[PDB]
Design a protein around this ligand. Structure first.
Ligand code: BEF
Ligand SMILES: [Mg+2]
Length: 994
């Protein structure tokens, strides 16, 4: 029955034809279950173990590589017994690596869900209903609840389903809807209809929403909706309906598919130059039945010599490394790519109630009278530290710790706070934290009392559980609580009637301790307490009291104030009627004012500092909350989003004010304003979307259901460890610690990972250029193959492997943060780096066939072949007489290729040291700035000597150990590449912007 809120109680009962006194009959339940299904969200947690792998391979580059594998498959398939002892190994290698990444990534996803399953479904969901079945209330599975059911809820209960309040058993009912509405202070409900059919959740004051919890009171109601029809249900679907388009860095890799797919065409161009050369000569000794087995062979030859086949692993490795580091800070990163992505973020949108704030009401300011003398009235003002329910903090006066017990006024203040209170505080040994019991604004008084410790009770040797009520317990022993006059909306105050307890003070008599909205309570005070004595309430005294209440009620503070007083000579129980709250106000008159306490939903400790760091990092921080604007702004001032006295005319908007703006203005407003309050969940999503329309990598931070859609739409969703399950599933990262500053650390790391990431891409690909420049020089130009496929593979893969991951330990500069986030569209590899790795790329060419072929021509132990009899080596087993040498097989000798490979390797080791800095000379930025890199080169080099000695290896890799004379030639051929780049860099720093 949607719209139940607009209908009356009888209407809702009639609608389902159920008795309010007995509940549904077991026959109706069976029928309603049939017509409405069970109470519950559509079992979540999609994407199976299979789904993951599926999309894993759906990467452009893995695809390119895998496709390569199909083409190379027919090549290794079309190869005769010449070097096919391991030439067909290739496909297995590639394929293995493929599954090698599918396995890892998928591993991380499942893993994630696990850390993300932190006590969250550990506790079974129950619901209390009355059914014709029996007279007593029944505790059943919440999933078995159906619309029409009669439900009962009480303090501490989690509302099982969307319910229409029928009858309130307590004087009043209070609900904390923060987990859904972001509403700071609990909402007091009523049973009358809410006419406006368009009333938002904050207006449905006669409804209880599934997922929320009862702050105070007891009530009976009728279930309106369940499953996906509930407010929380709607949001889950809304959220699910939002699309996750793509990934910020993944997009970069999707983008590198360009540089390679493009070579696909580039090779076609180089090849086109020889194909036509044969459509001129009349030969019929093998058409499309025989002759052609060479044309398609080189296409993959250079292909694989094109794809820097390490990189997908290297990326996973370094990235994952960043993951772990984040984790050392309690940074659960549910996804590997966002790791770096949070770095690129230009904007951080953060929720209020539950994320930027702790969500626990806390008393921090208070005052009693100091002295009264005529028109003079001075107050004793104190401040209180601590921003949670924990009994940890201090009372200060003029910023210095004092002993509250030395102020008689505070002893009575603490006493009123402890006695005039229907709630308490507790320690959840399971969650390991303190929790309120009953109303937040009352628990705040409880913990205040535990901090004050006015009787200096011993608390150092106590357990967390005992510490929670130590001081309060002491005070509860001084007076017997006869009864309490519960809070009423007209009077706006609460009081308790107490009689003397311990015989220590029996000459005291009965007392009434009162608290409530300042104006009404102070107006009912005829006296003011000063220490232990009392003076009459005078205009000058009242003025001073009200002026400080006023200050605390707005401006920098904007605290919720409560006035505390006591009735020294209360009526006799007999002369008091306690069944009608309409009489209470009169009993709470002729009172003695004692003091005032100021409280509010505190910002988390580290938020202010965090927002300042982001500022310096050029990252904006925008508050987007469902709470009222007054509170939104107040918290913005406390954390620094707004100046203490700044005017926020057009920098803070309500949901409505925002909507009253033309789309264009709305969009613009997201770039200017930093506080959006009283907004709906779609509002949050909308704001993020606007930000993204300016090509800004945006992050969202939340805890409640109303954050879920925005969290998902943001490039990086960040959920509070103590937040809802929804918010977490919709996030890439979870602050298990609730430490807001971890976000900044994540940005910092997400940044270091990155830079060093484009790095191992530089150095790595280097080989492919040098690699095909040689194949092209020997195919369409001359000399035999200087290097082969299953030769260059071990290079790219292991030879260049450890060094890359090595770049993961690459030391970030000490100024990586104190600088703005990089361009959204910025390419990556280009301009002066394309040429930087192209030049170096094409150098290795003149170094391979060069220092290698060198063996063929001038190598003291090589043939001594002439230049073009080498560029025509193909015509050896026929036009032999033209160049009568010795054995037409020396052209397929391992020595030349080994000479070439060894040059590739040595050159890459050096370029590893170079790629250290984009434009910094190796003299300015020494190669020992990265110890891992030095060790990786050692490891790669010794792995080279391994492939050249251990019999099995040199056999399957078409090589042969070079001579010291040949190595020295390799060095003279390779080393100078450092000189070339050491020069190109210089030209970049001096005569260029570098
Ligand atoms: F809960 Be958030 F402040 F919207
Ligand atoms: Mg919230």
């Amino acid at each position: 029955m949607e719209a139940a809120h607009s209908k009356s109680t009888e209407e809702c009962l009639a609608y389902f034809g159920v008795s309010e006194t007995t509940g549904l009959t077991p026959d109706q339940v069976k029928r309603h279950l049939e017509k409405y299904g069970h109470n519950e969200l559509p079992a979540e947690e999609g994407k199976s173990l299979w789904e993951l792998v599926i999309e894993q391979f759906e990467d452009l580059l893995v695809r390119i590589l895998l496709l390569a594998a199909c083409i190379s498959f027919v090549l290794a398939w079309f190869e005769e017994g010449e070097e096919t002892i391991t030439a067909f190994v290739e496909p297995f290698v590639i394929l293995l690596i493929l599954i090698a990444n599918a396995i890892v990534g998928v591993w991380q996803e499942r893993n994630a869900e696990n850390a993300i399953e932190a006590l969250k479904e550990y506790e079974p969901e129950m619901g209390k209903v009355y059914r014709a079945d029996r007279k007593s209330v029944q505790r059943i599975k919440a999933r078995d609840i159906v619309p029409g059911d009669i439900v009962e809820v009480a303090v501490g209960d989690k509302v099982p389903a969307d319910i229409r309040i029928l009858s309130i058993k307590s004087t009043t009912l209070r609900v904390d809807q923060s987990i859904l509405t972001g509403e700071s202070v609990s909402v007091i409900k009523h049973t009358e209809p809410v006419p406006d059919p368009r009333a938002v959740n904050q207006d449905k004051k006669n409804m209880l929403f599934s997922g929320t919890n009862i702050a105070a009171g007891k009530a009976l109601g009728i279930v309106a909706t369940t499953g996906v029809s509930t407010e929380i249900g709607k949001i889950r679907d809304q959220m699910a309906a939002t699309e996750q388009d793509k990934t910020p860095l993944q997009q970069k890799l999707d983008e590198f598919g360009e540089q390679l797919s493009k070579v696909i065409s580039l090779i076609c161009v180089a090849v086109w130059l020889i194909n036509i050369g044969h459509f001129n000569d009349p030969v019929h000794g093998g058409s499309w039945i025989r002759g052609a087995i060479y044309y398609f062979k080189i296409a993959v030859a250079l292909a694989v010599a094109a794809i820097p086949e390490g990189l997908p692993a290297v990326i996973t490795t370094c990235l994952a490394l960043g993951t772990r580091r984040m984790a050392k800070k309690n940074a659960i990163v549910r996804s590997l790519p966002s790791v770096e992505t949070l770095g690129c973020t230009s904007v951080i949108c953060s929720d209020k109630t539950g994320t930027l704030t702790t969500n626990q009401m806390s008393v921090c300011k208070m005052f009693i009278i100091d002295k009264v003398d005529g028109d003079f009235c001075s107050l004793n003002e104190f401040s209180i530290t601590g921003s949670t329910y924990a009994p940890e903090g201090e009372v200060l006066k003029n910023d210095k710790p004092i002993r509250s017990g030395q102020f008689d006024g505070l002893v009575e203040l603490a006493t009123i706070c402890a006695l005039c209170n229907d709630s308490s505080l507790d320690f959840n040994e399971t969650k390991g934290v303190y929790e309120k019991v009953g109303e937040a604004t009352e628990t705040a008084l409880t913990t205040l009392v535990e901090k004050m410790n006015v009787f200096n009770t011993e608390v150092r040797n106590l357990s967390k559980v005992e510490r929670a009520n130590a001081c309060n317990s002491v005070i509860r022993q001084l007076m017997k609580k006869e009864f309490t006059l519960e809070f009423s909306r007209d009077r706006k105050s609460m009081s308790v009637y107490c009689s003397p307890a311990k015989s220590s003070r029996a000459a005291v008599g009965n007392k009434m301790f009162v608290k409530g909205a300042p104006e009404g309570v102070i107006d009912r005070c005829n006296y003011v307490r000063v220490g232990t004595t009392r003076v009459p309430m005078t205009g000058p005294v009242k003025e001073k009291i009200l002026s400080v209440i006023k200050e605390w009620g707005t401006g920098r503070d904007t605290l919720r104030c409560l006035a505390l007083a006591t009735r020294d000579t209360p009526p006799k129980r007999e002369e008091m009627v306690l069944d009608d709250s309409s009489r209470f106000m009169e009993y709470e008159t002729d009172l003695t004012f004692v003091g005032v306490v100021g409280m509010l939903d505190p910002p988390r400790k580290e938020v202010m500092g965090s927002i300042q760091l982001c500022r310096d990092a050029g990252i904006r921080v925008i508050m987007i909350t469902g709470d009222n604007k007054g509170t939104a702004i107040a918290i913005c001032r406390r954390i620094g989003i707004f100046g203490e006295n700044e005017e926020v005319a057009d920098r803070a908007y309500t949901g409505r004010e925002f909507d009253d703006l033309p789309l264009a203005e709305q969009r613009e407003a997201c770039r200017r304003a930093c506080c959006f309050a009283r907004v709906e969940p779609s509002h949050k999503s909308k704001i993020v979307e606007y930000l993204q329309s300016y090509d800004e990598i945006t992050a969202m931070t939340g805890d409640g259901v109303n954050d879920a859609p925005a969290l998902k739409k943001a490039e990086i969703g960040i959920a509070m460890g103590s937040g809802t399950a929804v918010a977490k599933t919709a996030s890439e990262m979870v602050l298990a610690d609730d430490n807001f500053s971890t976000i900044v650390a994540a940005v910092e790391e997400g940044r270091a990972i990155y830079n060093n990431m484009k790095q191992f891409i530089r150095y790595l690909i280097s080989s492919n250029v040098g690699e095909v420049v040689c194949i092209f020089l020997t195919a369409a130009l001359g000399l035999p193959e200087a290097l082969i496929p299953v030769q260059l593979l071990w290079v790219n893969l292991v030879t260049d492997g450890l060094p890359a991951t090595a770049l993961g330990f690459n030391p970030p500069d000490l100024d990586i943060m104190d600088r703005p986030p990089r361009s959204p569209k910025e390419p990556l590899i280009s301009g002066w780096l394309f040429f930087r790795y192209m030049a170096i790329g094409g150098y290795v060419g003149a170094a391979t066939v060069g220092a290698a072929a060198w063996w063929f021509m001038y190598a003291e132990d090589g043939p001594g072949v002439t230049y073009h009899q080498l560029t025509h080596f193909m015509q050896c087993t026929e036009d032999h007489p033209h160049f009568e040498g010795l054995d037409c097989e020396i052209f397929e000798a391992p020595e030349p290729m080994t000479m070439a490979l060894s040059v590739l390797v040595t050159i890459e080791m050096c370029n590893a040291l170079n790629s250290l800095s984009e434009n910094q000379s190796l003299m300015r930025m020494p190669p020992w700035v990265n110890i891992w890199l030095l060790g990786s080169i050692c490891l790669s080099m010794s792995l080279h000597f391994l492939i050249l000695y251990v019999d099995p290896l040199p056999m399957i890799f078409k090589l042969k150990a070079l001579d010291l004379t040949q190595w020295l030639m390799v060095l003279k051929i390779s080393l100078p590449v450092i000189g070339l780049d050491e020069i190109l860099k210089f030209i970049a720093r001096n005569y260029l912007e570098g």
